[model samples]
Target chain A: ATLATKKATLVAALKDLQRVTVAFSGGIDSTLVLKMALDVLGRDNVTAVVANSELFTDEEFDKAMSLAEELGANVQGTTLDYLSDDHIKNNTPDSWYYAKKMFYSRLNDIAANNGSAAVLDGMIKLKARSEAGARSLLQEADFFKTDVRALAQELGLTNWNKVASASVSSRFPYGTTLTHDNIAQVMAAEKYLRSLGFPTVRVRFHNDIARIELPEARIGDFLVFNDRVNRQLQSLGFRYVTLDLGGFR
Target chain B: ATLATKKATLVAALKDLQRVTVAFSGGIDSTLVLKMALDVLGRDNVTAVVANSELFTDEEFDKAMSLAEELGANVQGTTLDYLSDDHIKNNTPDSWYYAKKMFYSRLNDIAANNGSAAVLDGMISEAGARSLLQEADFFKTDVRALAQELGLTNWNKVASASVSSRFPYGTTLTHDNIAQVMAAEKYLRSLGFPTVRVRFHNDIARIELPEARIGDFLVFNDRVNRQLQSLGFRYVTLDLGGFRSGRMNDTLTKAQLATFA
Candidate 1:
């Protein structure tokens, strides 16, 4: 539990690999994997990867790349044309089966450098399509991870207590069309709230209605800065804007 | 059934209404209703009203009015703002509920020259895509038998389907996209296919015409391809199954259909 053993555990995971690719989103969990893998295998042996999405823009990507570069790990990236995929475009909630599978395949691409002829000598270094179960499989299969929150804090991570998971389409009800504009609207509202100095914010879209979720500590600041906040959202065409009293979980 | 009795049956059905409006689309059935209503009640009592979707452009509308004029009836028209209705704008097939209900409500509007506030006693006549629904076939009738039997002009018009009918189910029925389908089909119809549908799959156009008319389609391929692309379709295709109606329902399983019922 001291995270010293957790670091030892991560080292044991990477010992046999000549090189490894980490499914990197710059989130605390993957960052630990990427950082520890680099420590174990040397920076030359580690590649941290991220998937490019509408929300994951080029500017944010550059920051992530430099951040990985600072730690001496190569950052590689992959993307899908969400607009072109019918399920993604139509927001066919159930039929968008490739959501997780694509993430795993993209990591494979980074490991292989997309050369069809390359050999795969390593198991992928992290999660997809399962929760606690995937972790067991990864450990049994020789990839490493341990208690994330404790390890992230021990590592003095900037986002050690990162308040939200990645942004979601769940803000929209399942049958609701996941149009790019809807995503833009939700993100813009969250971005505005975050810029108002809340450490963490998520704006879930319920059609044109904007539901703002902020940390319990910062709910008053959201209301105090209410005028500019309300103006920005109103201009975005949201018919109503609301605060999530339960706060950002 | 003598053709005379057939015409008489339709004429007699309309003889009772003091004022009537037919949902006219320049098609056979409603055209029959419009003509016979005018013939029985006189021009003063009859209104030839058409629902104007973005796909139902002014040019098509002008032809409908001209057809009514040729039959010596005055015409009135109503436009549907599909965008105003969420389901209609989204082109969810379930929005077909509004397609008829909206048209009839508008039918009442013109029939009484009234707003929703106005109430009047009269029946609305329909041209149809109804009979094509097997489950609803009994309600979605073919009174056109009388019109065809009576030797009315264009009485045997094979199918005067809508521009919306030209799309595959689940295709977002946008104003511009629906108009493009209308524009593409109008060009295809010009090529001598008696009926045509340019089923849109986003950038792709799946052409449905009579299977035997692939010769006509091929002869016009260069022109059709160029024209459809100009109309904004990236790939123009031929549906070898040819001109089929209710093909949208082909994609719906019985489980899906049960949900609707």
Candidate 2:
């Protein structure tokens, strides 16, 4: 469907529901959903739940909270102790499913308390929904990534995070135990790398070794910071700080 | 002093030595010394000894060998086991002194065996070796001026540091680690960064390039990273501090210095 038609469908879905708890993650898609939910269902009916978890950055969480508030919805911060779950703590292959389940459950509880008919997310037709008793208004309205952007542009949504970060659990090998200290180590290393101008980077954990992944193109620009990064990450508990020759995955 | 005066001084010094072993490193300084030794004392009197050691590259040793022969002087390749010394093998802070002491000792032995009076090195200016250029009061400019005057053009311009510089002090220098560093550096040099260092940090290979060339170095990043990984580095990284670390004026320099303090 055309973007305008998709927007009409989304607006209709929100209007029919009369209320929503939007899962706002500060990404363009989530920003679009929150804005549209606030626009169609009004501020009183739209609750923006920004999940604050150790699995993501505090900077990202703060940004999402501010973005949701700027979108004029009633924003709430939700913290999930993901490490409390053994599946996530052990970093299993199926940790993603369990993480999603935990996330949606929190949003659903928020929705129930606030009298929101459904917990809405920014998911397009590319991925899934249904199992969480939540709604992907964008997917139901036939919104692809491009459609989401198109409507966001039409709605004058200029401020949003263009890059979406995956859960920090991905940094560990599947069976590696995820501890608070090790997770913090990875996060700090990556945060330092990003401050050095590589926004898309990963500091993969290998005990005393930190195998950093960066875009191949940016690797050249990364040359000047090699010593500093190596030493910095060493101070952060890694004995060997290294760049992945494979580049960013 | 004038370039002509310097050449005269260099000639008289070489003539006095009668027979000498020139430590030809293929660099312009040593190249000038070797050529001068041959020209003044005749090829029969001059033996160009190119030292091959685990601490330096085989390519450098080969190039020096070829360069000496190209100059019409008989060149001999002498391999020194630098790691034979505990100080050098363990890469102590005094490892450079031990390595050089071993280098000069070998050259002195070659001179003694060949009936040479003195060991000639490219020092434009050191201990236990004869630097005719330095005796002539030749500086870097004089070396260039005399080289041009003699129409001597071919030589290795970039001076390679000992592979020990790649490892942290006290890290034992093994054949595998030395080979790994050399191969990684050779690959980078092949990619047009002649002045590159692949510093060894155990599993990590931190590459140091001149800061000025870094902007132009972006295109080769992937190839260098992947190739170095294949050469045995688990993590391939570029040093932001560039070669010799803190050679450029930047905040990172101060931060690095503060850490040392």
Candidate 3:
């Protein structure tokens, strides 16, 4: 089916549901989905549950709130400190065994708190969600289903659903280790570099060094402002600045 | 000495040489020194020479040439195909040995051809060139004085009035493998991943892939791309697009004889 047809079908399906609490991150994908859900079900029927913690930066939180406000979606920022001893110790282990255990536990918590029949998430389609968990979630789906249902029964809940959505950013390599500070630094440097008339660029960070990769043609311009470029990178906490001799594709 | 004072002294010294050829790469130290040379001695007096080949990317050569142009200095490029029989036969056994030999030899050759009274290179003061090479020729005395005597001279000679000067690239790392590619390979190998062993054989290109991935060229290609990209390569192209134990240096002539000075 075409994207428009698929989207229309999804909207129709969502309209049948009474209440929805979207797992919103203020990223482009979740924001669009939340906006669509709000339009279909109305502000009162939809709730935007944004997970707030040190894991997300101030800019992210502000953006989330701004998007929620613009969409007229009832938003509640949940400050569930996942790093807290209770969650970390009970859910995750250093090994794969606890990974399966933790994912199910987290899912159950999300279902309980949302108080909705379905919990919509913005997970990328191409990536295996099970890979994120140390254990093979797909291989042990039957066992996981039984455990999730048992947990739901214990909590006086009967129904639960998991919705996986696609985002363009997910196509990027996993284990990228992107922090707010690093992202900001990369964005700022890239913006400045672009303003200098560079077109294809990637300011790859490797600790104290910012290795800039640009097109072969633009390398001449890069050398012209070498001192200024070095100063800018230094200001962004890079001790050393370098350009990749091999230009980016 | 303070950097400013040292820079000023270096500039003044380069000016005294009148005309010089710089063994220039677009690296941090060499490019800066090359720029300073052109500024002090004028465009006609300074020439930046870069050795190029398959081992070094065309992009690197272009960068060096562009920098030289920016400084308004004369630039010459030489493609010292290290895999050539003459080069391969002369230097052998190890890549490092050949690379250093080729670099020094090329620098000498460029300095000779340029009609330069002196070869003003950015081989820094901190590198302990005097002690390392164990020769006063490696150290920059008065270029005019050194130029007059050319009988079995340690440095390169364009004429009886030519000399070679060295300007250091600051402190060298006390550790082995300063280049990102070398260091990344080491790190990856430590983590049980197969890595590309890049041997810099002066002009010879000897690249070795891990033994395990010999049959699976596709997997090898993917791994190489990922690892090389992480080490700052935009696109990694495998030579012959095939797997070999020591295919990296296969281009080198087999009849190469080892020579030492």
Highest-TM-score candidate: 2
DockQ for each model: 0.00, 0.04, 0.01
Stretches > 4 Å off in candidate 1: A1-249, B1-15, B114-158, B245-261
> What is the per-residue lDDT of model 2 for residues A158-180, given as tens digits with 9 covering 90 to 100?
77887888999889988899999
Residue pairs in clash, model 2: A223-B239, A223-B240, A224-B240, A225-B240, A226-B240
- What TM-score against the true fold does each predicted structure earn? 0.39, 0.50, 0.30
Report RMSD (Å) for each prediction in the order shown.
Answer: 27.8, 23.9, 25.0
Using lDDT as the yardstick, the better of models 1 and 2 is 2
Error of 1 at B237 (Å): 2.6
Summarize candidate 2's per-residue lDDT along B90-145 as a digit string, tens digits. 98898998888888888888888999998888776144698788889987766765
lDDT of 1 by residue, A1-249 (tens): 445654575566577555776665555555666666766777667666656776444535655554554444566666755555556555565434546555555556666673222112223233444421222213334443445555555655443223324535556666676777877777677665654456467777776678788878766544435555666687777888778789885
Steric overlap count per candidate: 0, 5, 14
What does TM-score give for chain A of every model?
Answer: 0.71, 0.93, 0.50
- Please tell me which model should have the higher lDDT, number 1 or number 3: 1
lDDT tens string, model 1, B1-261? 333444555455555445666656666656656666666778887666655667566777777777777777766666777667766666777767766666666656565563222212212225321111121121112343334334454532444555666666666677788778888877877778656778888989998775335544567888988899999999988875456422322123324555654
Top lDDT prediction, candidate number: 2
Which regions of candidate 2 deviate over 4 angstroms? A126-128, B1-261
Where does the lowest 10-residue lDDT sum fall in candidate 1 chain A? A115-124
Q: Rank the candidates by TM-score, best first.
A: 2, 1, 3
